[PDB]
Amino acid sequence: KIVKAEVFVTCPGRNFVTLKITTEDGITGLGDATLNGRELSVASYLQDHLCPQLIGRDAHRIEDIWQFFYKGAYWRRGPVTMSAISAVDMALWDIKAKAANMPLYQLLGGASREGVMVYCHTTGHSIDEALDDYARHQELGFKAIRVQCGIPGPEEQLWSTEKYLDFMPKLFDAVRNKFGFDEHLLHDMHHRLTPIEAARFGKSIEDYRMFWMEDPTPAENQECFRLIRQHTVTPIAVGEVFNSIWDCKQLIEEQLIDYIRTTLTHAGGITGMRRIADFASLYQVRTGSHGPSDLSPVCMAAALHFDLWVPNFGVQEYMGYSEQMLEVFPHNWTFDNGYMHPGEKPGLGIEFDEKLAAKYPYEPAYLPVARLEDGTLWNW
Amino acid sequence: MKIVKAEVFVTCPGRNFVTLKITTEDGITGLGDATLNGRELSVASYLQDHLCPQLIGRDAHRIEDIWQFFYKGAYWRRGPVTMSAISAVDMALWDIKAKAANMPLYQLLGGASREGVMVYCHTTGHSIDEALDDYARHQELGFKAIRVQCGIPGMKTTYGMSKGKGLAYEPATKGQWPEEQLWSTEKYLDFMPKLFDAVRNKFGFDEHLLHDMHHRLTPIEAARFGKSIEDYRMFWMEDPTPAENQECFRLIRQHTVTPIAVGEVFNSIWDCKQLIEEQLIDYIRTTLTHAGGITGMRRIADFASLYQVRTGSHGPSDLSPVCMAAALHFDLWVPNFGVQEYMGYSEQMLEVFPHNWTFDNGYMHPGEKPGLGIEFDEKLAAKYPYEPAYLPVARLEDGTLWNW
Amino acid sequence: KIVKAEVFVTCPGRNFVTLKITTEDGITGLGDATLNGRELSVASYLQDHLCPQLIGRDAHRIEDIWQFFYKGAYWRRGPVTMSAISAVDMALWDIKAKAANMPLYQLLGGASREGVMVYCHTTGHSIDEALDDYARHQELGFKAIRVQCGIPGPEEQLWSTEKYLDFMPKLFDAVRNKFGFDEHLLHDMHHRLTPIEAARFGKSIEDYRMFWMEDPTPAENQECFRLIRQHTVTPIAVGEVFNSIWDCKQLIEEQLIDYIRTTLTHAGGITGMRRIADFASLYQVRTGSHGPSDLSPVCMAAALHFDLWVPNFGVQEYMGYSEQMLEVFPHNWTFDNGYMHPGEKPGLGIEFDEKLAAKYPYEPAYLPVARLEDGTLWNW
Amino acid sequence: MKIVKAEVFVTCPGRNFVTLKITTEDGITGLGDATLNGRELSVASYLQDHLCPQLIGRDAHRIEDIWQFFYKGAYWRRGPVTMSAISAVDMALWDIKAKAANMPLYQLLGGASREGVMVYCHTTGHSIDEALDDYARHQELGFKAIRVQCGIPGMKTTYGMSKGKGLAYEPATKGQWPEEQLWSTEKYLDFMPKLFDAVRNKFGFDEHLLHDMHHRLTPIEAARFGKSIEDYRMFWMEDPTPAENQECFRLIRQHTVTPIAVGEVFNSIWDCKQLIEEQLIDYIRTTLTHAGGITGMRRIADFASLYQVRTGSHGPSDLSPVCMAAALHFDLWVPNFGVQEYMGYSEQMLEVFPHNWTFDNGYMHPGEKPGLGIEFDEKLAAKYPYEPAYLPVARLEDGTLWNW
């Protein structure tokens, strides 16, 4: 029996929305509802609408509560809706695993791997800046590195597809010339391109053999990935902004992508993302979960548990966190030579320092938007 | 027209309404509806906490860039909550634009395609006889198109506080937890065609006859049901089966010539693209408040038209009179218009939203007032603070959580 | 209430057919019905058949009049039919915007951009002629330039596909060697090729990264673009000669093109071309409206209004006009550093000098035809 | 044979006809029909102002190059007006070519596939009884195939100057504005199958039974209607739904085995390629005057044949006796021939076009005269100047502008 369903919002120094479920017998569960830029919309969805409906209820019935909130909302999917349902899910699996006196990955089918490969972020204003950044991050032991750097030439940013097409292969060329192959080489395209520009981009970087190119073109219309897929063999990843298998069912069934980047916080929690992962396996599509700063350590934990089990695991993103971010969330995960592992403690193995949290009130922050030279509002 | 104020109001007289009011430097005012039954405060937040402070520097004239700015600029893209917010803005912006133009909004959309807008009512009963009387009542009111339902024998609620035989009008029930209904598809399949039989027998054809299936059946069940009602020439059979998987409408279309409507719960063209392009439906029921306002909904309708799909906008109590006035401008213009749903508003609800549409012999027509032709009495709105109220859920005999 | 629906035909020095609608209260609207080479066919369609039917009628009912002329004609589509209906449409939106005391782009949803990128025409007898032409047009400030030049070796012209395949990539090579990338590089193929020749053409110019190749093969059968699309990543544009969404629905739905070149005068006016534009947006196809001399300034105006609004705007063609052409049409559009903007006056912001117009009677002029060495009549 | 003259004539006895006459250096004459009901002068222009001066140097022998020269050389390619012009040329050119050959035109096409050409008539009534008498009248005239219609009870025009019960023969009404008709699909669906029932009941089978749906229904409506008339074994059900989107015929074909005809309004193989290749129709109703003359129409028919689609050429008052004489040569040859429509011509109309086809017991046969076997009396044509006349439009109860 759930006795309390509480929502917390904190900023050290970025916003996190956290759900805490308490049962009658003292077991306590944590869940991430963080939705970058629309945080208070989810907080209200939970505090005002889902949490009171979680009170009479048996914690054991994870599936039923999921279905109850999924279908019972009537207006069915969506980023806010799912960020909430996933928070409820995450906290209930936290509770169940504690109840099993097990780490979460154990309830899922146990470890399919000894370690979880993560990738880091590297960036510059110039190529030279980028290569020194890659070299220090290689030094830190990551086996997979996502590389970006500036093009020669909400916050509104300026975008030129054309300047990017002509210039950006030059980066991967440099990375490969300095440092060999062996490391996995990654790149985020940030939805900036047309399908046929993405095809062109893919071809032009095939020589450097990317582990993937991610978010090539906006994917509301999943048919738009067909064009890129018929023209390049550079691996494709997508799915940060997805909240549903309905967002990616076509991309996977038509073998248009190699990595699905959906996340526990945003795509349905353990319950939903289990189903998405399993579906992708049939098509030899692998998991490339988003791991930015704006998913809180609660999700990282659960995602290290998920990643430890999934047969078809690909990579985990680990953008990382502030010592200021992490200390609100006492964690027990480890890192060694480019692999992470979840705790071996019951549940998610994660805590929430409420008193510390209360030191940090919500502060408004929005993601940038992109505009052409034109001023036409583009995909950031 | 620099936007100078962007305010959200939550009022409950006596069901919840979320209303956005945008005010311009020169003092033009526009209203937008952002009501999302059962999750209202999330949108209120989505508007109040993130979006309305972003609307403050902006030129109200630039409706498209604003729509795209919020649509894409929210990096997380679709969905009921997000789209409820965006639509409210867009609706308010088009209200302001027609006011600036000194024109009823329909005039800006392309002018009128028709002299008036056909609306349908609902009728119900616990028994077939009851439903026939309700039908006769609405027939004498001049309704040309009527949606009929009635109870499945054996299946009345055992819940003592159910608003029950009401509920078809106001399904969201004041309180904390959703009312739980028991569903049997099998008893529905055997019984419901008898309702349409009896209606057509007593009151022949001449009336357009509508029916809502409330998402309960699977494709092959809906297929059979459509077949079993072909003799009655339904104007439509509505929300047959869950539509997240648009391919699920295929088995239905293969097997019956009963007309198919869907789209109440949709917030985007991406929710219905496949259904339309594949000609799996005849009527698209998406709404201004939930499906992207004037801007987003003109796109859906125009796309639909290419496939000879007509509009059949959802119009329950939980869309505010602002969305209603707006829908009537859209309906009066839209070339591929089919029908408009018109659930009543109580007097209580309407005196908060002074309006100017009219009704005559089954057809509605909006203001000839500039903008939408709708107001929002903030002083009377302030009298009705938010009250929690939630949509039912359905469970099978199993206890299985099912589609409501 | 419309009181007059007048058609004018003038030649300074090229033919234009113009429609002028007057309402009871003095508001006046202008519309382009110019159809190159068949001008008097449209003039008659209007004066003899549509205009008298516009007299009793309410100017506000733009949609209804469109539908009334579209379906009521019984014989439904076609270049002449649509050139007429579009003229009626254009003039009625001119009237409506005046009635709103607004520039037209405002009624459409307002400006999505600060400027409208145009491309110019450049040509030669030789490559050197072409490059000096490009350099002077770059000097004039265009950011997009369509390049043609002669192959070494109605008016009937001679055509050799084979000489063109072997030679024409040599041009883009020269343009890129002299002047860098940055500028958008364009080319018109004039329907001259087979689908598989077009595929070959596309591949061979991929190295120069064209903004587009336009009208690769005749498109009555839209399936003929499939072959080019599976073999090249050079962007494709098409649609000058289209009058309908039915002409291009398959090309867009199957993601066979990147730019749709339909025009207000020829494809249904604001009402029709709004629908075509919107449909193309779903597939990330962008607008590349034809802007030749034989669309009159009335259309240019309205097209600058349309272009200013369309979310999915791509480019506007601006072949340009004679000082002799423009002075019949007092205009208020501007040009600055490769961008155009429509007036800020009510309506289209365009006028028609009738008295001047009457100085210039119609004169017969036809487009060339193309013939192989054979004499077989080919696609010009 | 150098073309020396190329003239357009517009005459009205008493409906409009546009006729092209081509004259050769040696003095062979050929006539072509270019009539486009309701927009006649546009084609007249398209011929007179641009095309006929282009036909002046040319060798009349080169029919194909001429066809392509105008087809492609008009940079703007298809369409009712353009194609009306091109067909008129082509028809005149093939008339000249058979004259040069001293042969009836059919002989040049491949010779006769049949001894004669089946034609269908129309019958109508305000009531079913009336229509049955009209049926009996045409049955005794020897017609083997008959198209039947009649009024939908309640829906007679309230317009005092309507030619009304006529109109099925000459729908284009002299004047300035189109006559406006009110349409109800729902009343059509409930009533019309009763007409076919009554016909088959009084006069059994033995007659081929045809019916024109006039573009009024949507795919699922047409689907239902086809189903509802299966018992009567219609020879065809015609123009079911607008066909700009050829995919719209799919829902129809999936649901009924009632035969489907379409193509009156088509000007090109591109208008019907998908419909044929997908086997969505049984009869292709394109015409010599509107669909590309002998040259373009042999292509359409041959393509159709691959799919077992037969020809069912439209033949109303608004195709001239030149197009009729031409159609009978085409029909007599074409292997996949289905039926020919034969609306009468008044005596007035025919004395302008001295002809030589014959009719015997429901079958027509063209001249055994060289060329088409048709003339054009220019002196009597000159007596009847052009009179404006326009096709109706239909509006729904709504005022909505709909498909006529």
Ligand SMILES: [Mg+2]
């Ligand atoms: Mg990304």
Ligand SMILES: [Mg+2]
């Ligand atoms: Mg419903």
Ligand SMILES: [Mg+2]
């Ligand atoms: Mg071109």
Ligand SMILES: [Mg+2]
């Ligand atoms: Mg017909």
